[PDB]
Ligand SMILES: [Zn+2]
Ligand SMILES: [Zn+2]
C-alpha cells in the first residue's frame with residue numbers, strides 16, 4: 001500500500017485499502033473509515049464495483065436526469081466520491097471551512113456554503129436528490145466568484161469548480177458534448 005494519504009498526500013495514521021494500494025487518514029476518506037470490516041474496500045474500489053456490476057451505467061446521461069435521481073445508496077456513494085475528489089485538490093483548503101466576508105466594496109453571500117458543511121450534510125442524509133448536493137457544491141464556487149469580484153483570487157473558485165465539474169461528468173457518466 002501507499003504510505004501517504006490518497007486525499008491530502010501526508011503520512012500519519014493511515015488505513016489501508018484491502019483491494020487496491022491506496023491509503024487514507026480516517027476523516028480524509030468519505031465516509032470516514034469504518035471501525036472494523038476486514039477486508040475493507042475504499043470508496044475508489046466501491047465505485048469501480050458499481051461500474052463493473054452494471055457496465056451500461058457508463059453510457060452517456062443527461063445532467064437533468066442525473067440531478068432528479070433520489071439519493072439511494074449508489075447515488076449517495078457517488079456524491080461522497082465526488083466530494084472526495086474535490087478534497088483531493090490542495091486548493092480545496094480555501095473552501096473547506098466556514099468562510100467570513102469583510103472586504104471593502106463587497107457584500108457577503110446570502111447563503112454561505114463550504115465543503116465541510118456539505119460533508120456533514122451527506123453524512124446526516126440531508127439530501128434527498130443528487131440535485132441538492134450538486135446545488136450546494138456549485139454554490140460554494142459561485143459565492144466565491146461573486147464576492148471576490150475583480151481580485152485575481154476569484155480564479156481559485158474557477159479552478160476548484162473545474163475540478164468538481166470534470167469529476168461530476170466522469171462519475172455520473174454525463175453525455176460528452178462540444
Ligand atoms: Zn489525509
Ligand atoms: Zn481501494
Ligand SMILES: [Zn+2]
Nearest residue numbers: 053054055056
Ligand atoms: Zn447489468
